[PDB]
Design a protein around this ligand. Structure first.
Ligand code: ZN
Lengths: 64, 172
C-alpha cells in the first residue's frame, strides 16, 4: 500500500535533483577548465570523458 | 515541478541508454502501481483486457485476435518486460557492450504496453483507486511517462487514444 506512494512522493525530487546535479557536474568541470589554461583539444577530450562517465553511471544504476 | 526540462536528452548522452533507464524506471513505477491494485483486477472485474468498453486490448496482433483477460495480460506483461530488461543482448549491464541496432523497436513496444497498463488502471479501476489516497501519485507517474514519450515520440499517437481525457489537460 505505502510503497508506491512513498516512492512516487520522493521520485520527482529524486530525478530533478539528479538533473541539477548533472548540470552542476558539467558546469563545475568547465569552471575549473576555464582557469589553468588548457587547449581546445583537451577540452573536447575530457568533455567526451565526462559524457562517458555519466552514461556509465546511469547504465550501472539501471541494474544492480 | 516540471519534467519537460528533465526528460530531455543531455549533451553527448546516447539516446538508447536514456530510453533504457527511463523505461526501467516507469516499469518499476507501474509494477508497484498494479501491485497496489492487484486485488481488484480479479478477472471477474476485468474478463477482457480493455481500456474501457470501446478500447479493447489483445496480447498478440493480427490474422485474427485471441482471448486475453486482464490479469493474465498484466502478469505476463510484467514477467515479459522483466525478461527483456534481464536480456543482456538488449539491455547490457557492462560499459563495453553497445546496444543492439533493434533496441528502439522493443523500447517503443514495451512503453506501449506499459501505457496499456496505465489505461486499464485509469479506466476500469478508477473507482477502487480512490478507495485509497493514490490518484495523485498515479497522475504524477503517468505525467512523467507521457512527457517522456511525447518528448521522444516513442508511442504512436493513435495508441494514446483512451487517456487523452487527461493528456492535454495535464500538460496545461
Ligand atoms: Zn483489472
Amino acid at each position: 500500500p505505502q510503497a508506491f506512494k512513498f516512492f512516487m512522493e520522493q521520485h520527482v525530487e529524486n530525478v530533478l535533483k539528479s538533473h541539477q546535479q548533472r548540470l552542476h557536474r558539467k558546469k563545475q568541470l568547465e569552471n575549473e577548465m576555464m582557469r589553468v589554461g588548457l587547449s581546445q583539444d583537451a577540452q573536447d577530450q575530457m568533455r567526451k570523458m565526462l559524457c562517458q562517465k555519466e552514461s556509465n553511471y546511469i547504465r550501472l544504476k539501471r541494474a544492480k | 515541478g516540471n519534467l519537460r526540462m528533465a526528460v530531455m536528452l543531455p549533451e553527448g548522452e546516447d539516446l538508447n541508454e536514456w530510453v533504457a533507464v527511463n523505461t526501467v524506471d516507469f516499469f518499476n513505477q507501474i509494477n508497484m502501481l498494479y501491485g497496489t491494485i492487484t486485488d481488484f483486477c480479479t478477472e471477474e472485474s476485468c474478463p477482457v483486457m480493455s481500456a474501457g468498453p470501446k478500447y479493447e486490448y489483445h496480447w498478440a496482433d493480427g490474422k485474427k485476435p485471441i482471448k486475453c483477460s486482464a490479469p493474465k495480460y498484466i502478469d505476463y506483461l510484467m514477467t515479459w518486460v522483466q525478461d527483456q530488461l534481464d536480456d543482456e543482448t538488449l539491455f547490457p549491464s557492462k560499459i563495453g557492450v553497445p546496444f543492439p541496432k533493434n533496441f528502439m523497436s522493443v523500447a517503443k513496444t514495451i512503453l506501449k504496453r506499459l501505457f496499456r497498463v496505465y489505461a486499464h488502471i485509469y479506466h476500469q479501476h478508477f473507482d477502487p483507486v480512490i478507495q485509497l489516497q493514490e490518484e495523485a501519485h498515479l497522475n504524477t507517474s503517468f505525467k512523467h511517462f507521457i512527457f517522456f514519450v511525447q518528448e521522444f515520440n516513442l508511442i504512436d499517437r493513435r495508441e494514446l487514444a483512451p487517456l487523452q481525457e487527461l493528456i492535454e489537460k495535464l500538460t496545461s
